[PDB]
């Protein structure tokens, strides 16, 4: 009389998005590219970034 | 799921807007789309070829197709190409993806059931994933490659 | 409320070996709220409706169908 | 349709079971996913069998 | 939108088709301008909703009348909240580029719950209505577009 | 005293409720018009 | 099953002819059936309207309906409204019929299986069904509000 | 069919090339696919107000809903919004086509049949099918209206 | 591809989602570049058809051989004439942007054909190979990429 | 203008003066005109100071002699990030009312610090004086004012 | 320091220039600018009769004015009213400021080691200072009651 | 499991000698252990004011402690302090590893089964380790404060 | 070192008493050292396996002899390949400063193993005593200490 199949039980991930080394040497080389010089514009106003 | 929809699932269930980790998160893997694109055709190109080979390195001249064995039969052998071309594609479907949901969702649900109701041998499927997985991160480079075997290792580990 | 309906169906996508000519042609009454759905399946494979004719049912009654 | 078979499977099993017994007669297999059990239970919610 | 081509391709046998895979690179290009216009609607968020309750309270006064849901600061401000809400699930579908993660959770069950909470559908298609064209003085004109799309999507829905 | 003092959670009613005193807009009013002076039978046009 | 058909069924499984007991027991049923039938109209009238005041009794403003709860999407309050609607509805055969059999067959049986599997909380759904007894026994009075409130705390004891 | 499909199909059957006129035909097509995409969306934002205010135009306060009409029963009024909205829905997709033979094959295969068979009247729907012209043409533009008048004229045609 | 999606949305009762509407805007700027390829593959036909000759009874010499099938004038005619056949559904394909009336004319019952005809399929997927590798040398990268796309949807079809 | 106010309270044992408070009303009263003029000076950056220190080359082309400080490209890209970082100062002085927030971030001590950087005084002077003339043009009359007076608390306070 | 130069710090740290965000945080500080010089005014009107008042309520008639307390001595009381003047006074300028940084830096530095060493009540001075809250929020409004408060309460909670 | 013992478990089940990154992270945990050292000491210094002021903070004067709640027994109030003293010593625990694994093994492994089982509120003891969290980085400081939030919202995450 | 303070500490039900921080503090102190003997030794292994195998087929030639098990050149391979996971085991046990990692996965269980296997446990300690001379050659007098500590761990195991 019981229930084959009630339902399906979501079942979570083992990997988020701290992995798939990739997106995640994506997440490193990308934050370390904001503070690299950004040569674009005139000189005189990228040495006055903190 | 994916790893734009798994961002945007975690920033939801907590009522909380895109703040800056991510939008790092994000940005991160639209930097990573371009090699996941160009990874996924060629790894569409040549499929059978990479079964192939991953069966001549692990499954052939074996116990397993001699009689006896889990591959005697020519419909056992035609499922075990069948399975392995099922690794293939779901892996680069998580690869494209880069988020394992849709590996834990439409592949790892049922699949330990399966594999002890028909008496697959577990050890020899672990062992043609792996067989897979150099055979993809020779023929795609080891940039991707890593990512490929971290979804196809995932398989496997999910499998044991 | 039925009804008659004679209808073709395609079958483009394989080449099929067996017999298979009832489905191709039939002449066969279907219910009323069923219809709605057999009409838009058989245009889902690009079949031909020939004629459709009331079997039950008197058009423009209200209650009792 | 007949109320024979609303007798036989409907009438001692609950609405969740109803689908999985109802997918084996009829489609010849079990319910694939969580989300083509939700479209029949709203089926078996606001309609009839 | 990969989601979208990834479960296309996965109820066939078959891999994803380049053809899949050239709109996935052509979403990849356009998901900084995407960004910028979710950044524009986000950083705008309390402008839009008293825009949108502007507009809407002018348009239906019966939400404002007592025979209507919407009758006194805490339902008036349960309303505005739901706006908020239907705003932050537009600004979803724009990062997303397809209406997926916003219908999921703004659209699939909608008409029931607003039949049973007593308000009515058409008074919150009209303040989607009212976001829309705020959102469209707020932004550029291919930027009003492309927010327009989503925005188009929920008044669609909403009905 | 202590239920105000928490801190009210993220996505609640009351953070909008400002908002909606600011718009204002009370309802209309009664029209007025008496359902026994209707005369609906006739009201209704054709077309 | 019935309060006569279970009658029936205990004088049968015996053999026994119906004696004075079990007419009296009939006799009771038939003198009942008159509120009985008109508590289930009642009911069948505003049945939304219960739903809709049982949810702001008790589960609205909570952080159930937060982004976090269980009702947060909006598919899953419709499902709520679904769960509370099927709650009194199978409270009003149990009512109608004079027998909780029809719980046990049609709603407790693999009930607390699928809301230990879908991580529904128990409780808020114990003090949900809590509120539509208490909302339904005022809307129908206290003499037929003792038998709606029997068979609702009889799905609220076997769902805990 | 597309109008590509239509256009592959007339070079196919001849065994031609593309030449030059084809061309022409498809990239006047992938010019005209920007108003046809944007018309497509707009129309797709509020097709529940068009067939309301088409009903209120030629439809409502005539003898058809009045009792002996054939939309007085409300399911039959409901039956009305249905076919009103299936116009619509299938005029949109032959405009975004733009070629109408999924008309022919998916709305005026049978019809005729079915509203002769259920005494439908033909011509208050071919005043109903205009007025859905008229209310969608003012509200795309009189530039993607033409292409849209152009699939509800032919949706009238073929009905009469 | 504009019937794919419109069929896919068909079976569906929702409209088309905003993501296929995205893959159809990309289609249409992709467009111009389809016909150019196109109209190269059109007007070069018989030095492909000569060059996949060629190299495909280079490669399989059974055909030439009196117990094959293209023995003879008339019947290497005849093959030329499949191969030319191939050649005009790969522009159909290439235009269309998506396999379906590429397969709906040449792919979807041509096992049985082949077979009651007496010609392995196996020389007719060489020889398609052989006009993507002619193509391919015709082309540039890019259009050499996106032709062999279909070239290859038909070498994986035959086989 | 508070915090001088309350320190100058704050030497005397008494309370803030009816005068002292009248000044902070107008204080507050000027100061969304002093907002648009740092809107103005803020989103006006690079040509103010890339024409204030061509300015100065034009008079004093001893800094960018060879024998001088500014030779060389890193050396006046430095120059100019002084420049920008004077002009930011005059932005906060203008913001304040004050001129303790020029003073203490960059008057206090800067004479000690040229002297130990080889650096000329009265070039500085001279382009600070230069940033008085380009944002003198820029703005409007009394606006410009107000501007070149804070500019000229630091040409005075720099010598 | 004001709430100007907090803006302004705050920003120099980051290294950039004051946008928008600063800008809308200085016209509220200048939005509430105009009714804090009318608290201060209001409150420089009557500080003695504030302090009086406070002395009256909270530290009068009790163990610590009595012989035996800390507040007996005449000198012990002069010390008393000019402490809780300063505190009337320091608020004032905290309030003036927008900015409790200060009023912590003048007295909020040494008072905890002073009031150590010479044995002085801190909840007395706590509850006088209160005492002076109440006062001042009674004398001069609601919200610039509460935002004297603020600081009046920064003090108190310096000294715990 | 330490971090030293991570590392060299990865370093192990490849076969690979300690390359030059395995000793960045093994020289980056040597340079973290001082103020890993200092932040376990001074939370074990005064772990029973952290947990008194935890409860202050989050639980107390709820409806929690009241009758009806789930902490209204005084066993249970009992039980609440041990629970919260133990979420706090492993969290230190896991701190000085530098690795959350012992979470995992010894109180993460079957805690969720144990609180539905009980009935106990899973959201009040969520924000119960939150205001453990916010009161301990302000008593160690925010540098150690982040690494101690680590495992506290570790702790957080595995128990929701 | 941690794991064992915690685990002691863990059987008791008290905390980690200061003198377990006190030895913990001055690990993570000489941990710089331990990282640079590792190094020192890692780099340098197959100069330690030579002189390892040089020193032990001197000192017992029965492994070399017929009648052993180190016969051949696929069984000296095998005999040098383990004499480089006993080298790998004790740099693990350098770093951990404590030699818990390295019993776990050379010690726990190796006497059954190599008697199952046939080989002498005497000629593989004989072996460990050689890797320690030859580091002790390698490295200088306080580095030699600290690696022949635990070298003198695994001669102690294996007998
Ligand atoms: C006739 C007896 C009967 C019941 C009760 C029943 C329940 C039932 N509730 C479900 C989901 C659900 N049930 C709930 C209900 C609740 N969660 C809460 O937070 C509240 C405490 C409670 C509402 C009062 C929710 C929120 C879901 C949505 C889960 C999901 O679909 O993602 C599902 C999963 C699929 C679906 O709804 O369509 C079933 C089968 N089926 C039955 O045949
Ligand atoms: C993100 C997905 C999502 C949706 C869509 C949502 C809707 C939602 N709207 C609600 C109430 C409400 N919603 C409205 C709505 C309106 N005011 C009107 O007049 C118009 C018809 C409309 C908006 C302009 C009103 C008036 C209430 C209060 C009704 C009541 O208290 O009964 C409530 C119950 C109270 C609450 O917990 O907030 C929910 C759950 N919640 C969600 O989490
Ligand atoms: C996609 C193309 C398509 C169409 C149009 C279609 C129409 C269609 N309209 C029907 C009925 C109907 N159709 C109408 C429509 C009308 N009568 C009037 O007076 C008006 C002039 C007109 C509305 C504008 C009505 C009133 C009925 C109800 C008859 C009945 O069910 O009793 C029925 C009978 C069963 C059912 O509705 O569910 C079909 C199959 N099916 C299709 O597949
Ligand atoms: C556009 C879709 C389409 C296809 C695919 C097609 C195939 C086709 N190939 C044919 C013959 C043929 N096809 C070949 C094929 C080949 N030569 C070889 O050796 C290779 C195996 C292969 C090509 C390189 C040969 C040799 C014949 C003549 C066979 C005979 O006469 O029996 C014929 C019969 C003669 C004719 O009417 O042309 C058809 C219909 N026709 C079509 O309309
Ligand atoms: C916000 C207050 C503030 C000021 C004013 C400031 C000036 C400053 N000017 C510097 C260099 C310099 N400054 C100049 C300046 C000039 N060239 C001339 O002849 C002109 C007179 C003058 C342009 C106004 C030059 C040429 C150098 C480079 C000198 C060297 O590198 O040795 C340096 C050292 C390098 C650096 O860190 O950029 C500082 C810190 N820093 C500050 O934080
Ligand atoms: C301007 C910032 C500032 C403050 C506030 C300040 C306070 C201050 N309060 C003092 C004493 C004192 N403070 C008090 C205060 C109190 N006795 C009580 O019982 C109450 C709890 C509290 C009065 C409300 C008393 C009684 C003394 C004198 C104690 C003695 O005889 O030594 C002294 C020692 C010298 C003296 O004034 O006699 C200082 C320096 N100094 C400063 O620079
Ligand atoms: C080391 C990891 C670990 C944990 C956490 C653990 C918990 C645990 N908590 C329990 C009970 C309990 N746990 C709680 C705790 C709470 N209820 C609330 O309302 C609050 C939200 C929360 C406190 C913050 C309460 C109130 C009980 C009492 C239930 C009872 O015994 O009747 C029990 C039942 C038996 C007993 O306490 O002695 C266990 C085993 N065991 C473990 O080995
Ligand atoms: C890291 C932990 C670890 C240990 C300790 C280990 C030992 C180990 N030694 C083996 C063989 C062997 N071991 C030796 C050992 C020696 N030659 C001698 O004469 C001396 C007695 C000694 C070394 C100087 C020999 C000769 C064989 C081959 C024996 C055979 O083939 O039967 C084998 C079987 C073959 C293999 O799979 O490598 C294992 C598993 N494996 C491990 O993973």
Redesign the interface.
Same mark, same amino acid.
């Given at each position: 009389?019981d229930?084959?199949? +009630?339902?399906?039980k +979501?079942v979570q991930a083992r990997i988020q998005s701290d992995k798939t080394p990739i997106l995640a040497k994506a997440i490193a080389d990308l934050a370390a590219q904001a503070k690299q010089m950004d040569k674009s514009k005139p000189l005189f106003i990228e040495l006055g970034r903190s | 799921q994916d790893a734009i929809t798994a961002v945007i699932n975690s920033a939801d269930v907590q009522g909380k807007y895109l703040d800056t980790a991510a939008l790092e998160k994000l940005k991160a893997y639209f930097s990573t789309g371009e090699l996941r694109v160009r990874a996924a055709t060629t790894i569409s190109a040549n499929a059978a070829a990479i079964v192939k080979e991953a069966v001549a390195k692990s499954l052939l001249y074996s116990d397993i197709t001699r009689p006896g064995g889990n591959m005697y039969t020519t419909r056992r052998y035609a499922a075990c190409i069948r399975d392995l071309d099922y690794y293939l594609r779901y892996a680069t479907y998580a690869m494209l993806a880069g988020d394992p949901s849709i590996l834990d969702?439409r592949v790892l649900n049922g699949l330990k059931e399966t594999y002890n109701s028909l008496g697959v041998p577990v050890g020899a499927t672990v062992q043609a994933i792996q067989a897979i997985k150099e055979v993809t991160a020779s023929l795609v480079g080891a940039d991707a490659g890593k990512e490929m075997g971290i979804y196809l290792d995932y398989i496997s580990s999910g499998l044991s | 409320r039925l009804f008659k309906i004679t209808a073709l169906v395609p079958s483009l996508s394989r080449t099929r070996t067996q017999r298979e000519l009832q489905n191709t042609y039939f002449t066969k009454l279907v219910p009323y709220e069923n219809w709605f759905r057999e009409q838009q399946r058989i245009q889902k494979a690009g079949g031909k409706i020939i004629k459709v004719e009331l079997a039950t049912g008197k058009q423009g009654t209200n209650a009792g169908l | 349709y007949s109320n024979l078979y609303l007798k036989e499977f409907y @009438?001692?099993?609950? %609405? @969740?079971?109803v689908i999985?017994l109802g997918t084996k007669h009829f489609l010849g297999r =079990?319910?694939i996913?969580?989300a083509e059990?939700?479209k029949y %239970?709203?089926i078996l =919610?606001t309609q009839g069998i | 939108i990969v989601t979208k081509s990834i479960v296309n391709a996965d109820a066939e046998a078959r891999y994803l088709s380049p053809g899949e895979l050239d709109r996935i690179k052509s979403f990849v290009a356009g998901g900084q301008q995407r960004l910028r216009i979710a950044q524009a609607l986000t950083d705008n968020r309390e402008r839009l909703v008293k825009q949108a309750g502007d507009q809407l309270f002018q348009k239906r006064p019966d939400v404002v009348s007592p025979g209507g849901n919407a009758y006194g600061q805490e339902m008036t401000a349960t309303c505005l909240r739901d706006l908020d809400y239907y705003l932050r699930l537009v600004t979803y579908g724009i990062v997303a580029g397809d209406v997926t993660p916003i219908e999921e959770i703004g659209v699939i069950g909608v008409r029931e719950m607003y039949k049973s909470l007593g308000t009515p559908i058409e008074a919150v298609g009209e303040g989607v209505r009212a976001l829309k064209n705020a959102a469209s003085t707020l932004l550029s004109a291919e930027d009003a577009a492309e927010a327009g799309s989503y925005f188009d999507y929920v008044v669609g829905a909403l009905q | 005293r202590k239920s105000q003092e928490k801190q009210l959670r993220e996505g609640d009613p009351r953070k909008f409720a400002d908002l909606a005193a600011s718009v204002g807009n009370q309802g209309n009013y009664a029209q007025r018009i008496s359902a026994f002076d209707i005369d609906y039978l006739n009201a209704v046009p054709n077309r």
């Open positions: 009389n229930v084959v199949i +009630p339902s399906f +979501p | 969702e | - | @009438t001692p099993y609950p %609405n @969740t079971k999985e =079990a319910p996913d969580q059990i939700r %239970n709203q =919610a | - | -």
